[PDB]
């Protein structure tokens, strides 16, 4: 299935969501967190899908610094 | 092979580690077989003060020898003594080759560069097995013990003085524990390692592999108690220890003996001299010593019935006797206490195990004669 | 890529 | 402790290969169990590298001390030469925790001084302070170990 | 200022001459400061056996220790300890701050690093008191004897062993002459620089700078008479010159009287022991003992009125009595002989010289004895 | 020795200057009398030397050590620094009589071992052997002294 | 007083040649030596007495290689 | 030059 999370709009497979506990609370769509970090979690679930349990070695997940606390109050809270 | 100078080793010929990051490689310096200590630039500061302490220590046989050392634009190297094994390495794996070195002569190199250390007023403060090292045989074939890292080059765990958790009594008690650990061959006067630090500062103190009946371990006791003393004003300086009966021969303990019993011979009986040597002399001589002794001895000193078996005294002037006259003695009493001075005075120590520890004692109140100076410190 | 996708 | 090197003395060769974009530090347990820090591989790079059967090896950031995998694993425990081959030893980054993952962001742009400085619920101020730590992670370890 | 590499030194400060254009300065190793010695290219193969030599040799407190050789375009340097004098300024120049070493003590620390180049089968071959070299005072102010410019590093003029115009006896012929250059303060056993060599061959071995009534100068002439012997195979080795008694301590001198008086008190006076003590007794005792020593202890003596004045035997065993007696006799008699040990030995070895020197070469016969290891060398 | 350094102690400040083109080798005798080679000077060049009063020098050839004149003299004597000027040494080449100045010819185009093969009067070899010696002139100096 | 010198022809000052004992033995005109010997000898004689107690440094007296011999003889001989 | 007349 797909979930609906809101800040903007975004779609993403239940099982990429369910890696926040918190949504995984929640979904057993969301609103909450700006867009421009919404948007960072929705892309640490897709590297976190992607390269969980791979063979290939893995790259480095890119944070520019200017998001790193807004980044970090919303992975302190997910 | 790195070359910093006159400084070079081969990355791959790690001989072990020291504190922070520092790697120790088997180099060459100036053609000799040399260690060489890789510092990271963090502790540029530390290896200053380590080798502004090797240089400017007067050399000593038992202190680490320090050859040079080099600035790469990464590192410092520091080019020391090539040794064989550490201590640990020693009491933990005694298949290494030890050419005729000694557990009591070990530890005696050891107070004798820590003495030396303490003369310059510097205080190791990490005294343990890991810092002391066993050298590489000399051309004789012979092999010493070595004191490194010392002065700094704390947090070492099961080996800090309670009060430390700066003074040369901090070493005594680390060497305290170093004695009892060759003594023992492993163990730790406190325990285990983790309960080790929770146990010096509760004081244990457990010295149980010393056996309380023999005299070995009743003089190697009597010198480690005092040097892991809670208090550290009762700990022995290192001068003090090298003192001590713990690191007498044969020759000097039956020569302590008969020292005494001449100073005692023409003293009297109510006097200071002889009442603190008779304190607890019934658990010396066994209550009568004259029964404690083999028949053979027995027999011959049965010439002399006089002699009284309460008397700390009598047993000393009664053995050294048979010393002064041992030529005459018949051979079937010469072949049971055995040839001067070795196993004569084993003869003695072994029954009275407690004899030498009470008399070393007993005879501190007169330690200030020139009699007695090789026996005791004063200063 | 799943860090920054197009 | 638990974890620690047996003295094997048996000589086993192995290839040290940092598979991550980071400097990694290659942490060696003594045979008491205490780390002990050697030459750090640049990225990319791989080492031929003399070690011994039985030995435990864990690979730390060298700079933040981050926890690095190797062949999918925290420890990393040389085995025999077998057919001669030298064991690969693939440091690589593990997939960190969104929250880990920024921490570490915010580790190298704000110094300790300034960390309870910052415009953050007051529980990262002590997230922020609970750097990463090789003996923390060796209890950790023995714990999950022993288990 | 020179810089080499590590070594550095500034050109002005010359120290002093080696051989073959070798000039020594004062410089600087790795912040220490160190002798530095400058070698022709014509010197590089030489100076490359020396350092091989100061390198692979044991380190010894009485060896000059060796640091690091550089090469520069021209030079080989060698860095060195430096030290303070040499021997020969030492004699010479008494004025120099000669802090609290003495003579024998100096001689002693000279044979100990012979002795040590001896052991590592290295025959210094050119000793003579130039290369030896008086070291800076230590943190504790004491000061050394050190050996440098040894196994060639012949032709020195007056140090030549006869035969050598490879054998360590070419070192104790030399050893020899310093030991009488020291004891004399500047003189020569073979006379004047000029006809030295010429008497070497001739075999001059004038001593007379030592008193034939002196004990210290008897013990003295009897240790450098056989250095010098002329046939090699009767010199001492430096481990027979170590254990004479010319190096023993007024307690040892005591010591070895009490350990001889000992010995012969309970012997056959036909014994071989006996007897070979009593050859030419009558000189060492004056004809009577009884009667050189002072009257108030005579009037002791006179208590036992048995001692015969002829017997050496008779000396020892009533110069052992009043020893063991000590503590007993009465002030007016201690006051004369003095305390204990040194003041006691120094009463009778003054008034009978050869008392010591007779007793130690009558007593060569039980050497092999456990009681006499000590006072002789055997191997 | 006759011919020997006093130990003064009173430093003199020397110029050594050759005035030769020839390389000089100082040559000090010790206290003792025995010559002791100091570091050579090259032709034309002069230097600042310390030295003390009553010591003794003499100059030489550092290749052939020919004899060499200072300030017209065979030895050389540092007087106290009057005024404070440092003493001049000036080393010089000798008149050399024609026979001795041929046979320093020869000695330098002819190698010891083909001496005794010049087509030359055989008493020549003698004088060609007979090299400057710096011990035999201390000889020669102590008894023009001493008469 | 000059005199004269025979290998060639060569005329010294007397204070001059009686640099030579040979020559000053002989004058109390000379003939011998090979000109390009003899020619090197009064060069000699020149040089002697200019630079004897000169003031002056001192130049080297220039000896060619192929005449070292044939004046060494000569010196020797003079 | 008195070594090398003219
Ligand atoms: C390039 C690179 N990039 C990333 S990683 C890397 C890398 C990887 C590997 C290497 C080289 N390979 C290793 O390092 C491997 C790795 C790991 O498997 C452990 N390992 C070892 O070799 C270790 N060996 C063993 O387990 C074999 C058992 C034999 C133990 N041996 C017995 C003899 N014992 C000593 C002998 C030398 C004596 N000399 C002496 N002298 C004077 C002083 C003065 C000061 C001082 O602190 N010291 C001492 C206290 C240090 C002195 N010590 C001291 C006693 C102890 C060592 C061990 C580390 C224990 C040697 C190098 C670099
Ligand atoms: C550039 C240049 N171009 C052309 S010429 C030139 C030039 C010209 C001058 C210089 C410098 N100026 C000099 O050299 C002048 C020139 C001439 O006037 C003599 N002169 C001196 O300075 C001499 N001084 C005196 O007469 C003053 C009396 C004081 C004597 N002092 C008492 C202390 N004594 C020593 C102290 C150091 C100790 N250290 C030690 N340690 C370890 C070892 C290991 C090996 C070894 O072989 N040795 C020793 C045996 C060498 C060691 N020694 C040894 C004892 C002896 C020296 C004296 C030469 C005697 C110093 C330098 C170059």
Same mark, same amino acid.
């Given at each position: ?78 | ?55 400017? %220590? ?20 520091? @080019? ?67 004191? %490194? ?25 680390? @060497? ?43 003089? @190697? ?89 309460? %008397? ?26 055995? %040839? ?40 | ?6 | ?147």
């Amino acid at each position: 299935m797909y979930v609906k999370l809101i800040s903007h709009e975004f779609i993403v497979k239940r099982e990429h969501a369910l890696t926040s506990g918190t949504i995984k609370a929640m979904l057993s769509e969301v609103n909450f967190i700006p867009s421009h970090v919404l948007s960072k979690v929705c892309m640490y679930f897709t590297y976190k899908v992607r390269y969980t349990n791979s063979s290939t070695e893995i790259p480095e997940f890119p944070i520019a610094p200017e998001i790193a606390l807004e980044l970090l109050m919303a992975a302190n809270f997910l | 092979v790195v070359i910093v100078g006159k400084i070079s080793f081969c990355p791959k010929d790690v001989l072990g580690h020291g504190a922070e990051g520092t790697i120790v490689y088997r180099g060459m310096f100036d053609n000799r077989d040399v260690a060489v200590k890789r510092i990271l630039p963090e502790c540029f500061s530390f290896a200053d003060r380590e080798v502004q302490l090797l240089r400017e %220590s007067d050399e000593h046989p038992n202190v680490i020898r320090y050859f040079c050392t080099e600035k790469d634009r990464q590192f410092q190297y520091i @080019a020391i003594e090539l040794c064989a094994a550490t201590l640990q390495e020693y009491v933990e794996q005694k298949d290494f080759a030890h050419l005729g070195l000694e557990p009591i002569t070990l530890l005696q190199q050891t107070t004798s560069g820590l003495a030396h250390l303490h003369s310059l007023n510097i205080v190791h403060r990490d005294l343990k097995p890991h810092n002391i090292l066993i050298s590489m045989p000399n051309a004789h074939g012979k092999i010493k013990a070595m004191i %490194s890292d010392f002065g700094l080059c704390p947090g070492t765990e099961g080996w800090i003085a309670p009060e430390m958790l700066p003074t040369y009594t901090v070493d005594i008690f680390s @060497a305290g524990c170093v004695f009892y650990y060759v003594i023992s061959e492993g163990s730790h006067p406190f325990g285990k390692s983790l309960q080790r630090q929770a146990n010096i500062l509760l004081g244990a103190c457990s010295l149980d592999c010393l056996h309380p009946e023999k005299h070995e371990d009743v003089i @190697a006791r009597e010198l480690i108690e005092k040097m892991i003393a809670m208090d550290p004003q009762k700990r022995p300086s290192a001068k003090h220890v090298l003192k001590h009966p713990f690191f007498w021969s044969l020759e000097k303990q039956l020569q302590f003996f008969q020292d005494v019993s001449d100073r005692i011979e023409k003293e009297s009986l109510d006097g200071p001299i002889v009442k603190q040597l008779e304190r607890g002399g019934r658990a010396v001589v066994k209550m009568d010593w004259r029964e404690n002794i083999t028949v053979p001895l027995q027999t011959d000193l049965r010439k002399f019935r006089t002699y009284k078996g309460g %008397s700390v005294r009598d047993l000393l002037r009664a053995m050294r006797n048979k010393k002064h006259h041992y030529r005459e003695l018949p051979a079937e009493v010469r072949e049971t206490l055995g %040839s001067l001075p070795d196993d004569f005075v084993c003869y003695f120590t072994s029954r009275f195990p407690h004899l030498l520890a009470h008399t070393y004692r007993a005879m501190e109140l007169c330690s200030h004669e020139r009699l007695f100076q090789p026996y005791y410190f004063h200063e | 890529r799943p860090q920054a996708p197009a | 402790p638990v974890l620690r090197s047996v003295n094997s003395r048996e000589p086993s060769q192995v290839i040290f290969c940092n598979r991550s974009p980071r400097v990694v530090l290659p942490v060696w347990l003594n045979f008491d169990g205490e780390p002990q820090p050697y030459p750090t591989l640049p990225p990319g790079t791989g080492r031929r590298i003399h070690s011994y059967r039985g030995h435990l090896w864990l690979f730390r950031d060298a700079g933040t001390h981050d926890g690095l995998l190797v062949n999918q694993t925290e420890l990393f425990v040389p085995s025999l030469n077998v057919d001669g081959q030298p064991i690969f030893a693939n440091i690589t980054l593990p997939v960190y925790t969104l929250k880990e993952r920024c921490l570490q962001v915010v580790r190298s742009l704000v110094k300790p001084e300034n960390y309870r400085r910052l415009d953050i619920v007051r529980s990262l101020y002590e997230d922020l302070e609970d750097h990463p730590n090789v003996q923390k992670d060796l209890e950790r370890l023995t714990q999950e170990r022993i288990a």
